Amino acid sequence: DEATWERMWKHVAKIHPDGEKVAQRIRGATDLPKIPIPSVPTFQPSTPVPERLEAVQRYIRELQYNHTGTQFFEIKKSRPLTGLMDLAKEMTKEALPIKCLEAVILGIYLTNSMPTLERFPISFKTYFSGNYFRHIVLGVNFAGRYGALGMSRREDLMYKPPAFRTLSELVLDFEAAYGRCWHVLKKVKLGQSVSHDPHSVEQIEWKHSVLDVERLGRDDFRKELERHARDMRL
C-alpha cells in the first residue's frame, strides 16, 4: 500500500509548520523506537465488569489518538455488525492510532463477551466560534448505572466509569464538560443497544433518537433521554 503511504506523508508536508523536514528526519532515520504491540485484554470470569471496562479503556488509550491527519481504518457506518467486527479485529492486529469512531467499534468488539453490559452509541454535535464539531462515544449501562468508553482529544470527553444513576446525568456531564471549553451542545444522537453477536447481519442503529438540545429545553430534554433509556429495555 504505497499510494496510501505517500498520501500520509504528502499530507503531513502541508499541515505541519515544517512539513518536509519532519518526514525527512523520520523516514531517513535508521534507528527508531520499536513500539511494543499492545496486548488485547482478556478476562477471568471472576473479574467484575467495571474492572474489565477500565482495562478496555486502557487498551484503547494505549493505541493513542491519531494526530497524523490520516485515518488508517475507514468505517462505513452502514456496514453490518459482522463487518465492523472484522475491522475491529484488524485494528487489534495492526495496532495503530485511532480516533473517536474507531474506538466505538473497538469498544463493542471488546465488550461482546459481557452480556450483562449494555452498549449504545452517543454522538454529539457542538458549536464553537462559528464552527461545528462532531464527537461520538460508546455509552454503557451496567447494573442500572451509566458510563462511557471512547477516544477523545480531551480527557473529560471520553471515559466515564459506570456510576451515573440515569442517562440524563451521563449526558449532562458531557454537556458540562463541553461548556467548560465554551462549546454549545446543539444535538445528541443516541443509538439502540448493540447486539452481542459479533456475526450479526444487522447495522448499528446510530439514530434511534435525535434530540435538538436548544429546541427542547431543560426538563423536556431530560424526559427525552429517559424515554430513550426506557426504550433500550425493549
Binding site: 489518538y65 485515518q71 480516533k99 473517536c100 469512531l101 454522538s123 464539531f133 462532531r134 461520538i136 482529544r153
Partner: peptide, 5 residues
Amino acid sequence: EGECY
C-alpha cells in the same frame, strides 16, 4: 465524526 471534541 472526525473532530473528536
